[PDB]
Amino acid sequence: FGVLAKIVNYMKTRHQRGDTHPLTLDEILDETQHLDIGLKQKQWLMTEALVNNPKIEVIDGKYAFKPKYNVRDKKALLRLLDQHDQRGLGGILLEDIEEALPNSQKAVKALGDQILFVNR
Amino acid sequence: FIQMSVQRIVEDAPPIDLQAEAQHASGEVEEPPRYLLKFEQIYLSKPTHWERDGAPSPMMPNEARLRNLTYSAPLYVDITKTVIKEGEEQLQTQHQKTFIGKIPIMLRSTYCLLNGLTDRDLCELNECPLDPGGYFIINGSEKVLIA
Amino acid sequence: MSSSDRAMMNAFKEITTMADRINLPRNIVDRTNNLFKQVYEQKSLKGRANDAIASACLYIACRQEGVPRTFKEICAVSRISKKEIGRCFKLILKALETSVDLITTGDFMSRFCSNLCLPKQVQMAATHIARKAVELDLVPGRSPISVAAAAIYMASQASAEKRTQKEIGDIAGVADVTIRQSYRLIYPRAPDLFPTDFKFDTPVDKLPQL
Amino acid sequence: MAYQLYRNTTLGNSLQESLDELIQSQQITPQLALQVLLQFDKAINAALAQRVRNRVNFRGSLNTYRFCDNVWTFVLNDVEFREVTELIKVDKVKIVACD
Amino acid sequence: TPASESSGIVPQLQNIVSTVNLGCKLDLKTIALRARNAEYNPKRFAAVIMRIREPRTTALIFSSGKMVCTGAKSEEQSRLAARKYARVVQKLGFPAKFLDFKIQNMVGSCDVKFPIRLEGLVLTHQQFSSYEPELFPGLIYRMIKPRIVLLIFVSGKVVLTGAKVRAEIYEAFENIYPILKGFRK
Amino acid sequence: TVPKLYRSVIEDVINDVRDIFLDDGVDEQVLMELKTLWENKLMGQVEEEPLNSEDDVSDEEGQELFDTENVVVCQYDKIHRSKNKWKFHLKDGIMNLNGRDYIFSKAIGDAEW
Amino acid sequence: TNYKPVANHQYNIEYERKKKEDGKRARADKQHVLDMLFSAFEKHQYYNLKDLVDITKQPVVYLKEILKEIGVQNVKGIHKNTWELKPE
Amino acid sequence: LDLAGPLLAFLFRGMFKNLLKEVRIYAQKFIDRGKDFNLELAIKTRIISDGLKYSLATGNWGDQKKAHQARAGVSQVLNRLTFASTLSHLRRLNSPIG
């Protein structure tokens, strides 16, 4: 579990750092200098771990996003939010930061525009 | 009772040992620390009183009446500290001789040193020769046990 | 139905349990209980360990009764470092805004000589020796207890009840060299420091040197 | 913890060079060089704790110093190691002191 | 007419403590690495300890960029060292600055050259004077005029500290010396 | 006596890895080549920013890398300092002075800076 | 009568030990600690926070920041703040 | 016939059990810190001492907080109306009154 959590975390980290492009297991091993994990483990990770993950995205030959599938939309989630018929599913503050940029600067402007926040 | 019974209780089960928690994972510390306590003879001082200067003085039963003090003597004990520390340093022993209390004593007791004094001595002490006692003095007040 | 006082409530049991170990008069303890209560009521020093305050209250009461006990002694009955007691002490003096008194050697002549079972004549001789020495400021440095112990030593050395410095040092708690130094400071006047009402067991000329 | 640093010495390096040769001549496997070096490490540590007994006194003004990861690295100048026969004065010496 | 009936014994200032901000966050590990005459241990304290033989005061380099200068005999020398310290940190490759320099502490000392009866002194000025022979051999005088603390010893030696102005030491001493003379043994 | 001790270590280290050599299937003559090669090897400012207005109190760092210094490696027992007076308590050390090699079990020192 | 030791002996003994090392250690470990987490959680799915504190040499609040980062926590039906690695 | 010695030993036995446990509470504190042991600091001599002061003064018999009800008035102040009255007091006999 730990290694997978490490894989997810690195993938998250490198993507935030600037690498907004789909990756592979081998590419992670390589970049992390952990390639010598053993072919057996390497294989088991590739064709079972990244299979048992319930949210891992197969783009083709490259694994994609698990926590945020949406694009770098940054500001404005009004169309989704407005939908009072379903409240708007709205967005989590954590999800918003993950999306692109820190919430606060956007929020200050948003608080007088279209968004209201509850601490709950 | 003074001579043996309190001592028999001291003879009974005062030895106690205590072992520290293992506190898992600490490392390779060979096992949790352990401490044992041992006791020998119990000691009793003659009836005495400590004056506000911290100094001791003899407890005159006549003095006990006047100052309304409780007639009592210091009780002392042989104590031993004894390490089956569960370490390489097993059997390392440390000796104590510890004040445990002030025991109120019956008048004309063996420890009531006036018991040897003559009437003439007792009158010299301003004590009554026909006052055998046999009852405690507590806070300067005379106290007798009912059978 | 009283969580706020419960550390204070326990502190007075611990005050009583601290007064217990050396048979202290209750009047002293009562003022002490009153002192803490006052210190508690201020709450300005709530950011402090209760047992240190109790111990500091105790040192103060003895001085308030004109019979101080050494921190060394006060340490014997508590876990608090002499430093923290001194620190807390200062804070209480500032907290309660009250003055104190200077120590005198004679106040400890009684119990120490008692602990040595020395007769009053030696005890009283020491006190004069001490008294004369301080009036003359023969020892403008050494702690008065250190000065007192050497006087006691000198006195004991002037009687049959001689004792080794280490035993005296052991009773006073001071270093055996500190007495040895303090002795070196009082020795020049060993003969004349004695009271006029004294009976030598050893000539001042025959007083040892160290 | 074993001190790998003692391999970065003449003793350690002459071994490693001789071993590297044995690797160039392929007379040994690289894995073998590692176990022997590891054993040498364990062995040299033991020799320090056992065969070594002599002590030395030293004097010298401090020229430069550094400290990180519980290891001090100094460089002193006009230093003098003192021994009853092998007295040694030196203009400058580098001192590494592990914990 | 003199300001005091006794006057002088030049209370000489012996130590200055100052702080300054380099205006930037720094990596002390790198600093410790680069420096030829500094010490650092996060397990002991979060700052680098650097020393110079020219200033002989010692600097404290916080990760925040704040620094402390110590050992200096004068505020200028403290300023000089701190400035001298700030350059080399810059010379390590950092955007160090001389922002918000200020004096933190000054230390002085002197000898009245005569013994005094502390018993009388602690008695007469208990409100300010403080002493305990069971505590420390020196009497502690906390002046409030210019908020100065004095340390008074049986030999007559005195130390003054907590100052950010040198004149205050002279001033605090000008007030206390006559009193001391009035307490001559 | 000291060079003898060094040999003891040479014998002890070589012998104690012999079995490892075997585990690799490597011939013991190679071990002897190791030893043989080895033995042969043995022998002012007015603004908060113009900081550069104070340049140059630091000296040249290249003083510290030319092997002008003989090298010493040792654990430390105690380090002390008093403003400018330093004290050193060291143990278990390897010294290489003027190309020569030395060893010690304990070392105590003093220095000023 | 028993000698006054100017400072509590055991406290003093505590002092020789205390001066040797502090719990105030550094955070160069937004990595070494997760690796250690894989090691512990390989033995059991969930652990008590105090036990997690034992492997670590860092402030709990900082530790709290880590356990939030790769995991969640429980009362495990035992109130105790027990933490475990994220199943997802 | 019940006398002082077997009776005192019972309190002595009980307070010792109280004392043994109180010191053990320190032993728990001792393991808690793991800091060196102090025997004199754990001591609470007064507890028994003062505990005895109650039994002896009032004549009551117990921990007062719990068991004591069935043993009130064990002990009383001496009568000094006459020496014979005193001697009578010294030799009087009582019962659990059923």
User: Which chains sit next to B, with 3 or more Cβ pairs under 8 A?
Assistant: C, G, H
User: Which chains sit next to E, with 3 or more Cβ pairs under 8 A?
Assistant: C, D, F, G
Nearest to B144 among H3, H31, H90 (CB): H90
Contact status of C81 with chain H (Cβ, < 8 Å): no
Contact status of E27 with chain D (Cβ, < 8 Å): no
CATH number of the domain to which G60 belongs: 1.10.10.10
Determine F/G contact with 3+ CB pairs under 8 A as the test: no
Domain that holds residue C31: 2-99
Query: In 10 A of CB G85, how many CB atoms?
Result: 22
Are A57 and A113 in the same domain? Answer: no
Boundary (domain end) residue, out of C99, C123, C148: C99
Are D48 and D75 in the same domain? Answer: no
Find residue F71's DSSP bridge partners: D94, F96
Structural domain total, chain G = 1
Contacts 24+ apart (CB under 8 A), E76-83: E77/E16, E78/E16, E78/E17, E78/E18, E78/E103, E79/E18, E80/E55, E81/E52, E81/E54, E81/E55, E81/E57, E82/E18, E82/E20, E83/F44, E83/F45, E83/F51, E83/F54
- The Cα G56–Cα G52 span in angstroms is 7
- The Cα E132–Cα E121 span in angstroms is 12
Question: Please, which residues have CB within 8 angstroms of residue C78's CB and are 6 or more apart in sequence?
Answer: C18, C51, C52, C54, C55, C85, G8
Which region, left, alpha or beta, applies to residue A108 given φ > 0 means left and ψ of -120 to 50 means alpha?
Answer: alpha
Domain that holds residue F7: 1-43
- Residues in chain H within 8 Å Cβ distance of B79: 39
Find residue F94's DSSP bridge partners: F73, F103
Contact status of C76 with chain G (Cβ, < 8 Å): yes
Nearest to A2 among G34, G69, G88 (CB): G34
Burial class (CB in 10 A: 0-12, 13-18, 19+), E61: buried
Are C83 and C22 in the same domain? Answer: yes
Q: Annotated binding residues of E for DNA, as ranges?
A: 15, 51, 66, 105, 142
Cβ distance F54 to E99 less than 8 Å, yes or no, reads no
Nearest to D55 among F33, F101, F106 (CB): F106
> If you count residue pairs, one on A and one on G, with CB atoms under 8 Å apart, how many are there?
29
- The Cα E21–Cα C91 span in angstroms is 34
- Residues in chain E within 8 Å Cβ distance of G24: 43
> If you count residue pairs, one on D and one on F, with CB atoms under 8 Å apart, how many are there?
162
Q: What CATH architecture does domain E6-17+104-185 belong to?
A: 2-Layer Sandwich (3.30)
Method of determination used here = cryo-EM
Are C85 and C125 in the same domain? Answer: no
Torsion sign (Cα): C30, C35, C37, C40: negative
Are C37 and C130 in the same domain? Answer: no
Structural domain total, chain A = 2
- Residues in chain E within 8 Å Cβ distance of D73: none
Contact status of E41 with chain G (Cβ, < 8 Å): no
**Phi first, then psi: what are they for F5, rounded to 5°?**
-60, -45
Header resolution in angstroms: 5.4
**Phi first, then psi: what are they for E101, rounded to 5°?**
-75, 135
Q: Find the closest chain C residue to G3 by CA distance.
A: C76
Domain that holds residue G45: 22-84
Cβ distance F113 to D95 less than 8 Å, yes or no, reads no
* Residue from E106, E120, E108, E105 nearest E9 by CA: E108
Are D48 and D1 in the same domain? Answer: yes
* Residue from D78, D70, D94 nearest D8 by CA: D94
Contact of A27 with A10, CB cutoff 8 Å: no
DSSP assignment of E68-81 equals EEEEESSHHHHHHH
Nearest to F16 among D31, D43, D51 (CB): D43
Cβ distance B54 to C22 less than 8 Å, yes or no, reads yes
Are A67 and A101 in the same domain? Answer: no
Are A65 and A119 in the same domain? Answer: no
CATH number of the domain to which D85 belongs: 2.30.18.10
Q: Is CATH 3.40.50.300 correct for E18-103?
A: no
Structural domain total, chain D = 2
- Residues in chain G within 8 Å Cβ distance of E43: 21-22, 24-26
**Phi first, then psi: what are they for F72, rounded to 5°?**
-135, 130
Q: Find the closest chain H residue to B103 by CA distance.
A: H49
Domain that holds residue A15: 1-72
Contact status of F46 with chain E (Cβ, < 8 Å): no
Structural domain total, chain C = 2
Contact status of F55 with chain E (Cβ, < 8 Å): yes
- Residues in chain G within 8 Å Cβ distance of A5: 34, 37-38, 70, 85-86
Strand, coil or helix: F81: strand
Query: In 10 A of CB H5, how many CB atoms?
Result: 15
Are D47 and D82 in the same domain? Answer: no
CATH number of the domain to which F5 belongs: 1.10.287.100
CATH number of the domain to which C156 belongs: 1.10.472.10
Are C105 and C202 in the same domain? Answer: yes
Domain that holds residue D90: 54-99
Contact status of G15 with chain H (Cβ, < 8 Å): no
Cβ distance G5 to C72 less than 8 Å, yes or no, reads yes
Cβ distance D67 to E36 less than 8 Å, yes or no, reads no
Q: Find the closest chain C residue to E126 by CA distance.
A: C99
DSSP assignment of chain B equals -TTTHHHHHHHHS--EEEE----TTS-S--S--EEEEEEEEEEEPPSEEE-TTS-EEE--HHHHHHTT---EEEEEEEEEEEE--SSS--SEEEEEEEEEEEEE--TT-SS-GGGGS-HHHHHHTT--TT----SEEETTEEEEE--
